[PDB]
Amino acid sequence: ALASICQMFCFWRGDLVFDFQVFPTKYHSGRLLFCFVPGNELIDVTGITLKQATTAPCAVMDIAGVQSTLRFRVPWISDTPYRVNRYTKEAHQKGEYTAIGKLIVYCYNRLTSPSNVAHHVRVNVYLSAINLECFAPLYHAMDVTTQ
Amino acid sequence: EQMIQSVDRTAVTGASYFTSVDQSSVHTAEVGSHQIEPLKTSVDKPGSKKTQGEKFFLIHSARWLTTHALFHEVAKLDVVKLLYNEQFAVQGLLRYHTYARFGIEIQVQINPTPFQQGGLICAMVPGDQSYGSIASLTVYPHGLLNCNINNVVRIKVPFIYTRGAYHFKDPQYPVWELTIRVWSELNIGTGTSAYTSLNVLARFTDLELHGLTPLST
Amino acid sequence: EQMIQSVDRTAVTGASYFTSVDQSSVHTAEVGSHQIEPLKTSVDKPGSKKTQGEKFFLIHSARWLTTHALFHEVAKLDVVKLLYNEQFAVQGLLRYHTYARFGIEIQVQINPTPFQQGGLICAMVPGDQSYGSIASLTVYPHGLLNCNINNVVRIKVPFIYTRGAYHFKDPQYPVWELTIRVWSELNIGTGTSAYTSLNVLARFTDLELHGLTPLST
Amino acid sequence: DDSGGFSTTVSTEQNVPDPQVGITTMRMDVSGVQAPVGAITTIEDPVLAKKVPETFPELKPGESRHTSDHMSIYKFMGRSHFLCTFTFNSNNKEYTFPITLSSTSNPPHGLPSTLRWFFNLFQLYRGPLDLTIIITGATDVDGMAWFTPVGLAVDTPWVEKESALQIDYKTALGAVRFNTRRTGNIQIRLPWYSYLYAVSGALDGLGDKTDSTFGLVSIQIANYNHSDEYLSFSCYLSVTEQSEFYFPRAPLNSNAMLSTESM
Amino acid sequence: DDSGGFSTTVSTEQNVPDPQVGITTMRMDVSGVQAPVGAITTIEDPVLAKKVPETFPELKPGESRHTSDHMSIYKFMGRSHFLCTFTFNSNNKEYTFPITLSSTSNPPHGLPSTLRWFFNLFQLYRGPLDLTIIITGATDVDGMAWFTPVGLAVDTPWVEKESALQIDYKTALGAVRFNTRRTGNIQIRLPWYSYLYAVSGALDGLGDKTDSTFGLVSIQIANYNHSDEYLSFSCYLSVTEQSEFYFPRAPLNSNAMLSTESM
Amino acid sequence: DDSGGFSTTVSTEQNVPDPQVGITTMRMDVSGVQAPVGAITTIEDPVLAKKVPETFPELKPGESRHTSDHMSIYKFMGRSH
Numbered sequence A: 001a002l003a004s005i006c007q008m009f010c011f012w013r014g015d016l017v018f019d020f021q022v023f024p025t026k027y028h029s030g031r032l033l034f035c036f037v038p039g040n041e042l043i044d045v046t047g048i049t050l051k052q053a054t055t056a057p058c059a060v061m062d063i064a065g066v067q068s069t070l071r072f073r074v075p076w077i078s079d080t081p082y083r084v085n086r087y088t089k090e091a092h093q094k095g096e097y098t099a100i101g102k103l104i105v106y107c108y109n110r111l112t113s114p115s116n117v118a119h120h121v122r123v124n125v126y127l128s129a130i131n132l133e134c135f136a137p138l139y140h141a142m143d144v145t146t147q
Numbered sequence B, C: 001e002q003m004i005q006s007v008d009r010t011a012v013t014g015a016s017y018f019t020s021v022d023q024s025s026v027h028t029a030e031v032g033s034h035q036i037e038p039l040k041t042s043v044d045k046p047g048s049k050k051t052q053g054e055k056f057f058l059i060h061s062a063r064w065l066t067t068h069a070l071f072h073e074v075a076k077l078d079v080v081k082l083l084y085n086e087q088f089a090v091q092g093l094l095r096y097h098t099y100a101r102f103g104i105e106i107q108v109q110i111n112p113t114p115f116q117q118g119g120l121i122c123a124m125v126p127g128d129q130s131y132g133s134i135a136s137l138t139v140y141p142h143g144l145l146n147c148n149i150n151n152v153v154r155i156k157v158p159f160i161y162t163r164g165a166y167h168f169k170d171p172q173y174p175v176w177e178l179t180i181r182v183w184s185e186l187n188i189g190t191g192t193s194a195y196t197s198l199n200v201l202a203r204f205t206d207l208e209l210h211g212l213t214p215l216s217t
Numbered sequence D, E: 001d002d003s004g005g006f007s008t009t010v011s012t013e014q015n016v017p018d019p020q021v022g023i024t025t026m027r028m029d030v031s032g033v034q035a036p037v038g039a040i041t042t043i044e045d046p047v048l049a050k051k052v053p054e055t056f057p058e059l060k061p062g063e064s065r066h067t068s069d070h071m072s073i074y075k076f077m078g079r080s081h082f083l084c085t086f087t088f089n090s091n092n093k094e095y096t097f098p099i100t101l102s103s104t105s106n107p108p109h110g111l112p113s114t115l116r117w118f119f120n121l122f123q124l125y126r127g128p129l130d131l132t133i134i135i136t137g138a139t140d141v142d143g144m145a146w147f148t149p150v151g152l153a154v155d156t157p158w159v160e161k162e163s164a165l166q167i168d169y170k171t172a173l174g175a176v177r178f179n180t181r182r183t184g185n186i187q188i189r190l191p192w193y194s195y196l197y198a199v200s201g202a203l204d205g206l207g208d209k210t211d212s213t214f215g216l217v218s219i220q221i222a223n224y225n226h227s228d229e230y231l232s233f234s235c236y237l238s239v240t241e242q243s244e245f246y247f248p249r250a251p252l253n254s255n256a257m258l259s260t261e262s263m
Numbered sequence F: 001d002d003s004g005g006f007s008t009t010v011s012t013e014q015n016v017p018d019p020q021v022g023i024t025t026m027r028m029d030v031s032g033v034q035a036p037v038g039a040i041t042t043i044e045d046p047v048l049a050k051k052v053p054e055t056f057p058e059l060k061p062g063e064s065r066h067t068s069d070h071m072s073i074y075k076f077m078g079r080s081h
């Protein structure tokens, strides 16, 4: 939804909200660290120790629990009042960015468990925004971001 | 008789810890003033000592195994020394001040599956463990971990040292040596994961920095 | 019927920009409290954003010669970019924040012997000099230097940019390009020193940092 | 519950319409130096899920620099968007195109771009619409146009042919006449004249044939000796204040968003 | 100084904006029969330099004969000045020109004459602009134009070619249609729609490519059998009251002031 | 927390110095005929762990026969060792 709307605007600003829903069993145990690295939509980030990531704003979540979703409210951090929908342009230009940085999912504590339960745990990532503002109407059907 | 304005020779300017004495001076020119964003370009608290220095950072991270015998030291860390490192933002403050006094907050967490059992103990010991009775670690500001119960512990302490501050560039003895040992052997049933990783979080509190310096070592 | 205390499973902790959600939690242990030195171990203001970031630093330093023709650019500097460098403490703050907005204070000084004559002009130009008339540099926040008169000048400005902040790690265009040119050829009598060295001081003002980051470039 | 039903846990509103404004304004901090309880929740529970999200300390955004809020449907769709376009080949002929929300009917024989997108964001629509049409090419060409409501006689859709309708009939439904020389564009309002309560785009075959249409427009030319230039017509629609929108749907997936690629 | 700085001598405002009015009026003598102390000063000192200049005894000038003050930027630049001009050669083609303050981009592929001059008198600009464009030549030519904001898709600049954009897309950004026969000129306002705080002319390469542009205009013709006359377009810009100008720069040196010499 | 930190659960004092006197005195019963809630706790939790231990009904100890409290460091180490 979030996308289908904003796709029709040139500019946007606000707090994007990432909701992480875990689908485990009362028998798994683990922690994941969510980390927002302020910047633009194209910053090599693979060279970042988990430790290194704790410098940027982030949050850790214990999966095993009575609760199921951690909400990541990514504060509007930019050098500009609004970001632009460059996803329409042919190529990319230093400064014309769509995002305010990238989010990273690290393995905080390895996933432990017995043996009569899955060898993993899937996670859903919802997206919505608050204090959202978009302006300058346009038409474009955003395609998929193949990570 | 009309007096006619002539510049003011001598004068003294500066900011923070930098002073200038000028003999053939003149006045300073300024234009406009500070403007406040009617529409902020960023909503996070503007950088401050607390922002960048009094926040949490991941220090060390190890494993706890079924192979680890009772009292096995799963970790021995010079908390302070560890923070002092480019890896963390707080460095930017430390790297430029010679000494500093402070308190600390430690958060240790793990993730044992309810099919695991056992526990650990985490203690904030000043200086060195010396020859203290392992069994009396509870005396130090500590946190106990029990699989069947909690998977986290938090300890908070103030500045405790023989000196009025810690010297980063070239320390005397570590302020704090956080120790983590096996409090009750971690056993399990055939099939369960035979381990659980563990992390350690730390941050300064009431960070008092002193004496700006260009050194690095 | 007496209710018997049982720990509080879920909970949320953190500090500054670091949050933790714990499901099998327990309470935090603390000992003692903050103590204030009845006898301070150091009398300087405890480190603060202003202490370490809003103070002066020597940026660049060059020579002005009798050989330098009128309008000769004695210095062209990306003030901001220059501060961003390990050499100065303020780095420790910049090195860890992605963007930041601010004002600047520049102090330029020299030491011509009264037997020398001539002068220079120092201008704080935003972005680039482009094709502006050298003769109209006075328009920009400037400071004029005349041997027979002053040997120092000070300029103070606020944040002036097209964007709501400067991006250090990877800038778009310099915020300020301080230019220093010969305003009147520096001549002398036979025997006098045919030059005078010159320095440039800079510091941030109203330093607003934003978005802690682990990057370096 | 008046329906004779009972419960022990509550029932709160889920996904409530028009929750917040669309322009940065203050309707201190937005959250901070307290404790972000809204950082954790059980999304499966409707109540809990509404708990306001908050993860880190932030400050109030402030005020936007522009007057109007671009996210107000009325103002946004207030920009007459593109609908369709056709071209006449022979003289004394006519074209009749339907205004159909149908997600099925793909352009050019259907709703395109923005209009297509918009009308599938919700289930029901009703209310007048301000159609405006631009004339391209020719000149000194007399023309006429009329709005025909769903369920009545009207020349075969999406097809240029010689009208098969009594001049009387045409004019009777309310019509307009114009000439390319004197104008080149027409902005007239389309009425909410339908036997239905409302219309919809997302439907299945059957209903998708009756309940997916506002109505139809028919344009008939005259005095167009093809020794002349070509005659093109372009239509655009803009929503009115008397227009209503009920029940939000999941937006059309990208693969179904089509546009009449031209120039 | 709130920045933790200290000084013993003062700090006064240097080169303050809008110091005096631009029309002869009284906002006795202006100086005289006293002693001209403002005849001497130490220009190197910012304070002293502001001391009002006075050398001989003069009388008050009086009142100008004309109503408005020609030196008020708003009123002066209120005169829509020249921007650019181009000509179409084939039918169904389009031209897209950017509005760039860049002192670098030399005309015709850049800001000319007055507009060039003006936009380099200061560092930052922001706010709407009233563009007005005159059509020359042809007739019965249908046309369309749209404003495209910095950072979005748009046909290649300063070049006449066949559009490569979905009619949908074009119209979507807000557009206008017209016909040479019925008009011959268009005056529409350009919005301050940019992700930047402001734009600037004086910059260096990189920024000079992103932060030096208000936006772009695109004009597309149709029905222009070149058996006809030629089709020329001329664009002029006028600053609005909602326009702002921050920080005065040293004016461009004469050698850099260029004009598109024609007629 | 003045350090810009936040929490949802509390933080109590752990292992507090000089908690009780060192000589039998009254600073009724000490616990009894009620219900020993302090017989159970979750030692891992700092708060709960401070809950006063009590398992069976006891009476107040009374008064020690000697003046000074031998457990006062000052007095104990007061004996030059």
Ligand SMILES: [Cl-]
Binding pocket: none
């Ligand atoms: Cl004619």
Ligand SMILES: [Cl-]
Binding pocket: D160, D161, D162
């Ligand atoms: Cl036919």
Ligand SMILES: [Cl-]
Binding pocket: E160, E161, E162
């Ligand atoms: Cl072409």
